[PDB]
Ligand binder design. Structure first.
Ligand SMILES: *[C@@H]1O[C@H](CO)[C@@H](O[C@@H]2O[C@H](CO)[C@@H](O[C@@H]3O[C@H](CO[C@H]4O[C@H](CO)[C@@H](O)[C@H](O)[C@@H]4O)[C@@H](O)[C@H](O[C@H]4O[C@H](CO)[C@@H](O)[C@H](O)[C@@H]4O[C@H]4O[C@H](CO)[C@@H](O)[C@H](O)[C@@H]4O)[C@@H]3O)[C@H](O)[C@H]2NC(C)=O)[C@H](O)[C@H]1NC(C)=O
Ligand SMILES: *[C@H]1O[C@H](CO)[C@@H](O)[C@H](O)[C@H]1O
Length: 356
């Protein structure tokens, strides 16, 4: 009976699946876009406006004659924000004091503003890139990642409180038979979550002839999954009780990518299908003489791309791609914000040069 599904026969598959199931109800930090440079640029805009003429200040859509000017259309929101911030009690005085322009003569105020022209031109592109980064990664959040991962593991699009529920773990709930429930990738795809995969790879069917403890001898199968997974929830609770995996914190794209690669390296192809978990004959029925597995119907090495279209695989891939971008953009934003704060310091120094 060595070719039958015996206890611990799916033990190593289960280790990988436990690592994936630990992505549920995840509370992770994400790489932060350092946007402190945006405030430094706003401070530079406020200095510039503070040093501007009464005619220019009185302007605060652009006025008639500049409504279609592309620079005014671009800058208007930035200028408006600077003007609004400067209206705050004592704000302008602080701006001018930080720049050494308190009670500055009119000639100095003018020369200082003009000296900011190339400074602001240099900072504009840096600030615009930082703002673009902020917008591009604004949906890479702990909440959105947790929801996507809970969709992957439990089929429940929620940030927390995700739990096993066959109605969500199997697409449209369990099928008429275990064999049909434990299929993914085909038209009638059912095992579309990590939890459904664990059920299919580890469950103890009722009726005898089961493969209890296939995923580990320390599982206490106190009940069973019923006939044709009708009561898989109780049995899943016992299986998952043995899993204590913890992903690295913060969660990284490299970790997720390696987890998915590991699964892909364990799927085995036979008779025109792919299988995760031990398969002997007929189907992934839960019977020890047939299989305790997911059948990736019609999956082949040449169609492996279709594995990555299975909902749980796609959800985790989406999270990994998003984190991949945000990791790089976060590292970029750190330098952009440092340069902008440096530009602010430079602008606060021009008065001392012009005076001397
Ligand atoms: C720091 O704060 C200062 C204010 O103290 C602010 O300066 C102002 O910047 C804007 C945007 O660059 C300047 O807008 C230009 O305005 C002139 C007309 O100037 C008159 O009217 C304004 C408004 O009343 C007065 O402030 C000014 O003193 C004058 O009386 C326009 O002619 C400019 O248009 C050119 O650039 C546009 C950019 O898109 C083009 O679309 C436009 O067609 C013009 O270029 C085109 O034609 C050119 C030939 O004329 C040609 O050379 C080009 O290649 C192209 O074909 C522009 O709208 C405004 O004048 C500035 N005001 C002062 C007092 O300096 C700074 O913007 C602010 N710094 C930052 C970083 O925000
Ligand atoms: C299922 O059938 C196999 C032989 O094909 C046997 O080893 C098992 O004991 C039975 O449950």
């Amino acid at each position: 009976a060595a070719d039958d599904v015996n206890p611990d026969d799916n033990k190593e598959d289960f280790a990988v699946l436990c690592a994936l199931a630990a992505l549920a109800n995840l509370q992770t930090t994400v790489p932060s876009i350092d946007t402190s440079g945006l405030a430094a640029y706003d401070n530079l805009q406020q200095l510039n406006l503070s040093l501007s003429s009464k005619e220019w200040k009185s302007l605060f859509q652009p006025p008639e004659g500049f409504q279609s000017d592309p620079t005014w259309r671009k800058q208007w929101p930035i200028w408006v924000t600077a003007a609004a911030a400067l209206k705050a009690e004592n704000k302008e005085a602080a701006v001018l004091a930080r720049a050494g322009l308190t009670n500055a003569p009119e000639e100095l105020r003018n020369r200082a503003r003009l000296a900011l022209i190339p400074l602001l031109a240099q900072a504009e592109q840096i600030r615009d890139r930082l703002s673009e980064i902020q917008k591009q990664n604004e949906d890479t959040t702990p909440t959105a990642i947790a929801k996507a991962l809970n969709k992957a593991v439990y089929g429940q699009d929620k940030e927390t409180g995700a739990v096993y529920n066959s109605a969500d773990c199997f697409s449209g709930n369990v099928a008429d038979s275990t064999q049909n429930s434990c299929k993914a990738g085909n038209q009638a795809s059912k095992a579309t979550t990590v939890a459904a995969t664990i059920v299919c790879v580890c469950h103890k069917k009722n009726g005898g002839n089961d493969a209890a403890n296939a995923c580990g001898r320390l599982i206490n199968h106190q009940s069973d999954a019923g006939a044709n997974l009708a009561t898989a929830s109780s049995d899943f609770g016992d299986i998952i009780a043995t899993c204590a995996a913890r992903p690295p914190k913060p969660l990284t794209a490299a970790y997720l990518d390696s987890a998915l690669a590991a699964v892909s390296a364990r799927i085995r192809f036979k008779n025109g299908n792919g299988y995760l978990g031990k398969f002997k004959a007929t189907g992934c029925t839960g019977a020890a003489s047939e299989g305790l597995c997911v059948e990736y119907t019609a999956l082949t090495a040449a169609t492996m791309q279709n594995f990555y279209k299975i909902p749980w695989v796609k959800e985790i891939s989406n999270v990994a791609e998003a984190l991949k971008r945000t990791e790089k953009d976060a590292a970029e934003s750190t330098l952009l914000s440092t340069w902008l704060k440096a530009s602010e310091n430079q602008g606060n120094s021009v008065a001392q040069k012009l005076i001397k």
